[PDB]
Amino acid sequence: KLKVAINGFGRIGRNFLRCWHGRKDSPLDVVVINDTGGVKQASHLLKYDSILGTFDADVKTAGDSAISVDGKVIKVVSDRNPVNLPWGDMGIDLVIEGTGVFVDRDGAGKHLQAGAKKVLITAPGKGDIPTYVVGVNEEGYTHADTIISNASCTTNCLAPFVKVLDQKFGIIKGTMTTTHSYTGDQRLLDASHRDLRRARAACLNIVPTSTGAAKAVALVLPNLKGKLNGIALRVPTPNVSVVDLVVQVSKKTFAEEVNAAFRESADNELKGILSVCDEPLVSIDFRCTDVSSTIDSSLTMVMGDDMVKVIAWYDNEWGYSQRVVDLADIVANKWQA
């Protein structure tokens, strides 16, 4: 019922499209794809993925400006400047901004100009923009918002179970460190970058880089403003990452009580978002996981009764996409104009 446009057919662009194809009766409907790459490029990479593996569906290069997916046809355009994209001409109701450049009022806006109605930024918003984390405050949304960000891959993980903690033990303060797979942003070989760390090898190092997810939590959980903050470590893995939260709560608590709380929420309210896992697994064992966050129960540990540490896995690509879709899935509902 809701016409969608994917701008920035990159990792989240494709991880999304596919995430979508798997949903049943989706209020969303992709019709146009805009990426610096030609129809060839869009086809190939939607079909052959080095992380999600070959796509189970018939994907051919139907057209000079389109591609086919199980028959459903989609147009592929390519303008490095949004304003030009025929969003208005095609009656684009929603745009999934996954390019990594248009993250600000000014930028994301060029989509509105092109005739688009709304712009969902597949990343944290820069400046004054509505940030929502499905499961943490999607009710805050209102069809009034023309530009929203679905936060970061990290925040979307850390948030859900932080809510659970604070909302039960009261987070006083706490740091966190996310051992994260690398991303398109890193340099494959020591090359220039504005982050001399991210500028390094990427596949040969543990690259400490900074993350906003720290303060971004507060963005969606107003209560924790200035109580959280952490860094991140980019390790040699193409996907799936883990967060190492460490909060100090008021209400003295113990190991299994914490985990318990998590499960409870994971079975009720956060069912579909959060989840626990006792089976001692590892990174790779968490590919294609529809949930945003997954607690590694056996790792959770408490100190002096009030210092809680929680490890949590999450597929920074898929799981996020599934959220992106779930958000857009929402915009389609509670949509009046």
Partner 1 sequence: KLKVAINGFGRIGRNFLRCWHGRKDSPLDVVVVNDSGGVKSATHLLKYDSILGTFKADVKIIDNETFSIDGKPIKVVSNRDPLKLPWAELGIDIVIEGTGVFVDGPGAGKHIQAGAKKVIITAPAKGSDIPTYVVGVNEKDYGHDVANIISNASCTTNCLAPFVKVLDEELGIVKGTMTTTHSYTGDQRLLDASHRDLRRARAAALNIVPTSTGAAKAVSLVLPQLKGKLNGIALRVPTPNVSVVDLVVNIEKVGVTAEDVNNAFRKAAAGPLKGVLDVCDIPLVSVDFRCSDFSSTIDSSLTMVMGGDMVKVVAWYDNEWGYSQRVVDLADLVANKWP
278 Cβ partners below 8 Å, 6+ apart? 297, 298
Q: Is 267 in the site for partner 1 (CB under 8 A)?
A: no
| Binding residue for ligand NAD, selected from 3, 4, 5, 7, defined by CB under 6 A | 7
d(CA 60, CA 236): 33
> Could you tell me the smallest distance in angstroms from the CB atom of residue 168 to ligand NAD?
27
| Ranges within 228-257 binding partner 1 (CB under 8 A) | 236, 238
d(CA 290, CA 275): 10
Catalytic residue among 153, 157, 203, 288: 153
Report the residue number, 50 or 81, with the smaller CB distance to partner 1.
Answer: 50
Active-site residue flag, 203: no
Q: Which has the closest alpha carbon to 245: 224, 273, 266?
A: 224
Q: Is 65 in the site for ligand NAD (CB under 6 A)?
A: no
Report the residue number, 189 or 255, with the smaller CB distance to partner 1.
Answer: 189
> Could you tell me the smallest distance in angstroms from the CB atom of residue 47 to partner 1?
11
> What CA–CA distances, in Å, run from 314 to 27, 28, 279, 293, 322?
26, 24, 15, 5, 12
Q: Which residues pair with 329 in a beta bridge?
A: none
- After what residue numbers is the chain broken, C–N > 2.5 angstroms? none
SS3 18: helix
| Binding residue for ligand NAD, selected from 92, 316, 326, 327, defined by CB under 6 A | 316
| Binding residue for partner 1, selected from 44, 75, 215, 287, defined by CB under 8 A | 44
- Choose from ligand NAD, partner 1, none: what does 7 bind? Cβ within 5-8 Å by kind: ligand NAD
Question: Is-contact 120 331, C-beta < 8 A?
Answer: yes
Alpha carbon of residue 45 to chain centroid:
20
Report the residue number, 98 or 174, with the smaller CB distance to partner 1.
Answer: 98
CB atoms within 10 A of CB 72: 12
Residues in contact with partner 1 by the rule CB under 8 A = 9-11, 35-37, 40-41, 44-45, 48-51, 182-184, 186-193, 196, 199-205, 236, 238
Binding site for ligand NAD (CB under 6 A): 7-13, 34-36, 80, 98-101, 122-123, 152-153, 183-185, 191-192, 316-317, 320
